[PDB]
RNA sequence: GCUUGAGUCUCGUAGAGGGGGGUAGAAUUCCAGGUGUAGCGGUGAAAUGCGUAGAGAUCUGGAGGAAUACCGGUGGCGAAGGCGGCCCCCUGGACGAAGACUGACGCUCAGGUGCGAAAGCGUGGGGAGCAAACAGGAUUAGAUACCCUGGUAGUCCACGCCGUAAACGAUGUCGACUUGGAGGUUGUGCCCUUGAGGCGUGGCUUCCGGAGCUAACGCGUUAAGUCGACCGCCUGGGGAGUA
């Protein structure tokens, strides 16, 4: 939200903003709601993120070249 | 892997906010339950706390306005 | 002592069992696999195993796993007996109608190498001819000499040469099968479970398999 | 104080603590080839120069 | 009867005239059958965000065991004065003693 | 609701023992109890659309137990409907 | 509700193979014994035992021999809703002569064959082969 | 007459389940006041429009109407449909540890009754954002289509009517039986819960597979597998799911 370390910049810096949520709000503000997408992509998104821990464990069995 | 919702039996009150800013970040978010890891249900607990707090000024919605 | 110090294996419950009859997976931290049907289960199997012994069956000794691959040329090449030690070539059992002419070929370039083209032509095309020879001996060599088909089936694993399992029953032939409670029980002449994946196994296993053949061909 | 030349930082306990179990008592890594083992071999395991 | 942790802040205005409702409002809890579990006053904690006039506020805990149709007469009188802005309470069978 | 201080004094009084509830003026009492309770929540604010299955079970299952009592002692039945009244 | 209780002990049989246990379970009754013991007697299922004071714990000890069921394919004739009333010439005989029929005569639960001993019938159990 | 079926009681558990009302924070449109520019919106490109009668933007304050962020989890509730902030009043369904009982009191079902998102209409309120009808600039051989600037029914709430759907893991409901694992969510019993563990017992749901079935893809303990009970429906498409 604020970042401001007196002066030892000489840089904008938006570390601090990018760090608190600053884009978070602009996505979900721009353009309409569409009361169905949060269904969607909640499921389809984190079912996913489920499959990279399961090629983890997926990929190191054989591999024998 | 915390003291807090595991081995701190019986739901934890925000009147000892000495531990409750340690769960929101310096603004007034909350921290996801896949980084400061506990289950999923006290998350919600602890969302029950950090809402009362944000009811009863102690835990703001965000850091100023 | 209690085979191999321990012939009821290990298992870690991802052992999946089904097997779970075959064994009564008594457990230690990451498991464990078959006590007692395991240990009996194996004096029996050396009887079997001397009958069809005697009655020249043929031995194979299949294990394409790296490690006790040369307890496979052990227990084969010492005395007489034929193995398979390497890659499991899809058809070298089922195909074999075809790879007995890969036999003329593997026991040609034998002679090639010997008193044939060994330096008849450019040392270019020579070099090949040789290097080949290495890579189709090493998991052809021990059935190359055989006068028929094997009877007797002494595979390893089947967590990974199930198909060495499944191509033998092509045929039909029994198969001596050292297995797990989350591998391929069903089509066998005799699973004797326990550990199949350690060095002294095939150690214990093979030596008291070795003396099984230096009785089988009197 | 390297696990190649001389031998396993603790009982068959890698430093990386990559391998654990008993049953891989003499798996050699294709780069690190350190075979776990007790460390009381480490007593018995002489290195060169 | 039952268990309604009142938290409530009044206004540093009221700073020095509330204690003496503190007198008045548990008080009405002993002449409305009810025992209170812990009797604090902290002070004028400085609030989280300034409640659309002053910053900072002056809060005081009560946690109190009283019938549920007394402290809804309560919560209306705190609703309905000039120090409380903010007053809420929990739900019954639990209590606690430390709020520290 | 049904609370349990008037749970357990029905079963104290209709029922010869603390803890002798699965029997037939039992249930149905406790049942009829839950109803003639109940009034307070389907008459005020009405739209309980999803609490009407719920009453559609307990009024049913009432009728189920009667449904037994009646042909096996008709002389508690017309007794039980006559002490508490759950017929009408 | 499990509205046949033969259903609940002849899907216990067929799936008890299909599970390939060597004892199996199920609720006891005059009837059921009478089929099992019936069952015993030819060489289907291995003593069956009662076990249980009130409660009769039809306890079962399935049979094989070569290493093949014997009991390999059966289920029910009667069933709940088509009651098959059958008399002694009109008989089904199972499998032409490898495979026989349970059937509750004026006597009682007995094979087919021993009911073409009495000359009677009425209620055919169920297939059992 | 007796219980392994159904169900009730004693003691408890989590939530977008619902109905009626209220509250909190902040914001788009609009209005006014302090400052100030000649441009703003938008598109592949362009433009109608607005503007020097000081817009867009920025700060503070205010009246309406409507919607619930991070936490969020092929997770949860339910017959289905459908549904996310919180509190207050009331209540139900699903499930479980250890026991006491009635003793098959159970399941389903044409005509029928009830629920029925959304939308249209009659009535009393209603209008910020958006949007059928319509107008205008254009890509184009034309625009009553994709874009953009406005705008009415409507969107919201309550009382009724039509009683309609992809009202679809497209798989009706109930009970029993048939090798498992990685998981997710919600309880409990036992052991040194000394610690975020181990071994059993139920509901819901996803994926990989065995027995089995199928045209095949694949379903697979929530089955398209094996039986019994109950209900609706089909006999090539079009005509037409229409008069």
Known sequence: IKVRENEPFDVALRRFKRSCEKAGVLAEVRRREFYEKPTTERKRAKASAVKRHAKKLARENARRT | ?????????????????????????????????????????????????????????????TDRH | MLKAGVHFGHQTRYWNPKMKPFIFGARNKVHIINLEKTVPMFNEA?????????????????????????????????????????????????????????????????????????????????????????????????????????????????????????????????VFAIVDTNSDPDGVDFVIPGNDDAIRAVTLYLGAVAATVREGRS | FCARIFGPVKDYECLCGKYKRLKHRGVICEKCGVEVTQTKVRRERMGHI | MRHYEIVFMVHPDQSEQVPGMIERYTAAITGAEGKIHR?????????????????????????????????????????????????????????????? | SLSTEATAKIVSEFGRDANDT??????????????????????????????????????????????????????????????????? | ???????????????????????????????????????????????????????????????????????????????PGLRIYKRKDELPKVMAGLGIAVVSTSKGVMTDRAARQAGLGGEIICYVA
């Open chain 2, 1 to 61: 892997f915390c003291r807090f919702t595991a081995e701190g039996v019986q739901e934890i009150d925000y009147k000892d906010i000495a531990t409750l800013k340690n769960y929101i970040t310096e603004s007034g978010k909350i921290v996801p339950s896949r980084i400061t890891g506990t289950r999923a249900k006290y998350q919600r607990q602890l969302a029950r706390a950090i809402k009362r707090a944000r009811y009863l000024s102690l835990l703001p919605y």
């Open chain 3, 46 to 174: 050396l009887a079997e195993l001397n009958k069809i012994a005697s009655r020249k069956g043929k031995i194979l000794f299949v294990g394409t796993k790296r490690a006790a691959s040369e307890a496979v040329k052990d227990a084969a090449l010492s005395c007489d007996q034929f193995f398979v030690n390497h890659r499991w070539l899809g058809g070298m059992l089922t195909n074999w109608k075809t790879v007995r002419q890969s036999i003329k070929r593997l026991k040609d370039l034998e002679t090639q190498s010997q008193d044939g083209t060994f330096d008849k032509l450019t040392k270019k095309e020579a070099l090949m001819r040789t290097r080949e020879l290495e890579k189709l001996e090493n998991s052809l060599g021990g059935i190359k000499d055989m006068g028929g088909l094997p009877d007797a089936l002494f595979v390893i694993d089947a967590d990974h040469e199930h198909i060495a399992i499944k191509e033998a029953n092509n045929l039909g032939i029994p």
């Open chain 5, 39 to 100: 009797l604090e006053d902290w002070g004028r904690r400085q609030l989280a965000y300034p409640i659309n006039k002053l910053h900072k506020a002056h809060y005081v805990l009560m946690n109190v065991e009283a019938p549920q149709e007394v402290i809804d007469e309560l919560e209306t009188t705190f609703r309905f004065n000039d120090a409380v802005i903010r007053s809420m309470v929990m739900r019954t069978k639990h209590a606690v003693t430390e709020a520290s």
């Open chain 6, 22 to 88: 699965g029997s037939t003026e039992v249930q149905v009492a406790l049942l009829t109890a839950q109803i003639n309770h109940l009034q307070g929540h389907f008459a005020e604010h009405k739209k309980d659309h999803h609490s009407r299955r719920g009453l559609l079970r307990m009024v049913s299952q009432r009728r189920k137990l009667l449904d037994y009592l009646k042909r096996k002692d008709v002389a508690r039945y017309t007794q039980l409907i006559e002490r508490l009244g759950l017929r009408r």
């Open chain 7, 1 to 79: 509700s499990m509205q046949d209780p033969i259903a609940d002990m002849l899907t216990r049989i067929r799936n008890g193979q299909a599970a390939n246990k060597a004892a199996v379970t199920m609720p006891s009754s005059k009837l059921k014994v009478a089929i099992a013991n019936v069952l015993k007697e030819e060489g289907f299922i291995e003593d069956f035992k009662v076990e249980g004071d009130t409660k009769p714990e039809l306890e079962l000890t399935l049979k094989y021999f070569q290493g093949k069921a014997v009991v390999e394919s059966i289920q029910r004739v009667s069933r």
